[PDB]
Amino acid sequence: HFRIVVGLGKSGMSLVRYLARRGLPFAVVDTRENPPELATLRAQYPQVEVRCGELDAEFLCSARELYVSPGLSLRTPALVQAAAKGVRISGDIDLFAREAKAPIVAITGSNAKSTVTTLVGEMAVAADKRVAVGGNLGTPALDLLADDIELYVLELSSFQLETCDRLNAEVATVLNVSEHLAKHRIFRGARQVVVNRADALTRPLIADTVPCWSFGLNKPDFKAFGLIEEDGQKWLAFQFDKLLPVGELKIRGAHNYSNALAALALGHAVGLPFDAMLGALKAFSGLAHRCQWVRERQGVSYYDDSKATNVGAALAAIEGLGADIDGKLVLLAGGDGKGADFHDLREPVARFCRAVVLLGRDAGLIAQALGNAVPLVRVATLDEAVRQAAELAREGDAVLLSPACASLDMFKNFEERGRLFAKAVEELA
Numbered sequence: 001h002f003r004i005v006v007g008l009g010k011s012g013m014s015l016v017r018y019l020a021r022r023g024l025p026f027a028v029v030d031t032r033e034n035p036p037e038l039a040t041l042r043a044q045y046p047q048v049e050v051r052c053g054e055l056d057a058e059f060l061c062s063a064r065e066l067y068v069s070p071g072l073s074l075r076t077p078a079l080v081q082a083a084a085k086g087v088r089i090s091g092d093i094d095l096f097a098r099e100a101k102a103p104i105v106a107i108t109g110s111n112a113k114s115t116v117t118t119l120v121g122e123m124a125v126a127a128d129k130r131v132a133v134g135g136n137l138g139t140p141a142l143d144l145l146a147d148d149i150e151l152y153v154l155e156l157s158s159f160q161l162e163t164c165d166r167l168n169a170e171v172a173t174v175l176n177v178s179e180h181l182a183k184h185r186i187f188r189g190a191r192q193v194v195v196n197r198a199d200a201l202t203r204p205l206i207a208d209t210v211p212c213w214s215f216g217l218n219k220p221d222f223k224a225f226g227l228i229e230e231d232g233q234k235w236l237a238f239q240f241d242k243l244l245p246v247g248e249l250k251i252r253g254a255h256n257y258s259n260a261l262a263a264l265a266l267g268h269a270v271g272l273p274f275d276a277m278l279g280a281l282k283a284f285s286g287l288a289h290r291c292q293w294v295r296e297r298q299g300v301s302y303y304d305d306s307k308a309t310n311v312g313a314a315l316a317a318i319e320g321l322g323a324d325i326d327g328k329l330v331l332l333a334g335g336d337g338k339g340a341d342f343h344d345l346r347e348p349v350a351r352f353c354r355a356v357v358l359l360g361r362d363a364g365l366i367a368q369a370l371g372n373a374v375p376l377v378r379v380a381t382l383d384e385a386v387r388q389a390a391e392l393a394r395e396g397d398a399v400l401l402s403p404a405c406a407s408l409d410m411f412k413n414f415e416e417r418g419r420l421f422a423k424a425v426e427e428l429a
């Protein structure tokens, strides 16, 4: 107990692995009497001291560092007592930041984190880098640590950044902010930043004193990635250099063009050559249920954006795909809204939608927020939502599942909702 892992779960087990494989002395504690991972720990690491129940503050103060699971309150009185006593309140990313021996690309934001992370990951692979990609919900960062790595690409949550004293990223970004200081801990020690010209809350104080690259959907200036319009066609661009027509991407929607430009900026900051980045961009087809094409039927396209589980995400996808088609959107939305203010959807819906089909627990709340902006239809099931959306759509339109809500009121998770949407779409005559 020179070091104590505080809290089991995904990251805690990666700390157990890391500390043990490095031979370091450590113990494990958890507040629950029978945490789910207790059996796995007791079986895979029988030699590790494990204490379950009310945290022994005296035991926690016998360590120099506590590695606190991200989704565990730092307000726990024993942690407060340990923190009041001088113990380092740490975590997996804090330890990773101090152990890493290669530059880190560090990505957070309210939305688009996994899209941009995986794209930078594919750029790095295409550039022949010995790259390691992880963080947040993916591969635990500590499982990536090795001397042969040339580049780390880390997606980070605010919770992981809370106990990280100085990440010292080579380049860091907050992609966007929607309902910020926790996110901005990603900039502590950052040697470069990438900012979103469309979101003022992404610009850190250090953007005045370290290299600052930007992305956005308007025409870029120096040190900026953006869109150039020429010959009626839109191009991804760096400064005055057209890179690629957006039509050669396999991902759709202006929000995904923004994600591509963010990834280009991140890869550029760490020296990835443009030919490698552009090759990966042409090959990148996006992640499952991130505005994914399902079908083209009678001139109408169908897109599964089931992972738009919050209002900021749906707004971006509505505006994004709405600006990327020949017609109007027929939007499918609703589900468990988690108390969100849906008013921000009214203007994008009025601007881009022919109609909205609403289902799920909070369809009524969404209807209240949308008012009479566009024609609304209420349905009971996803199958009926798709059938009605197809009848409402006209040639050139896109039918978009971008629900702005969690799915747990009717589905196991957003993946199941997306799959059942695609199934219904594929069963249309």
Ligand SMILES: Nc1ncnc2c1ncn2[C@@H]1O[C@H](COP(=O)(O)OP(=O)(O)O)[C@@H](O)[C@H]1O
Pocket: 109, 110, 111, 112, 113, 114, 115, 116, 176, 255, 256, 258, 259, 287, 289, 290, 291, 305, 306, 307, 308, 309, 312, 313, 314, 316, 317, 402
């Ligand atoms: N540039 C963007 N800004 C805001 N929302 C976006 C953007 N790109 C994608 N989204 C929305 O966020 C959803 C989740 O994208 P994802 O890349 O999985 O984000 P995260 O990993 O941060 O949860 C997408 O399905 C889409 O609805």
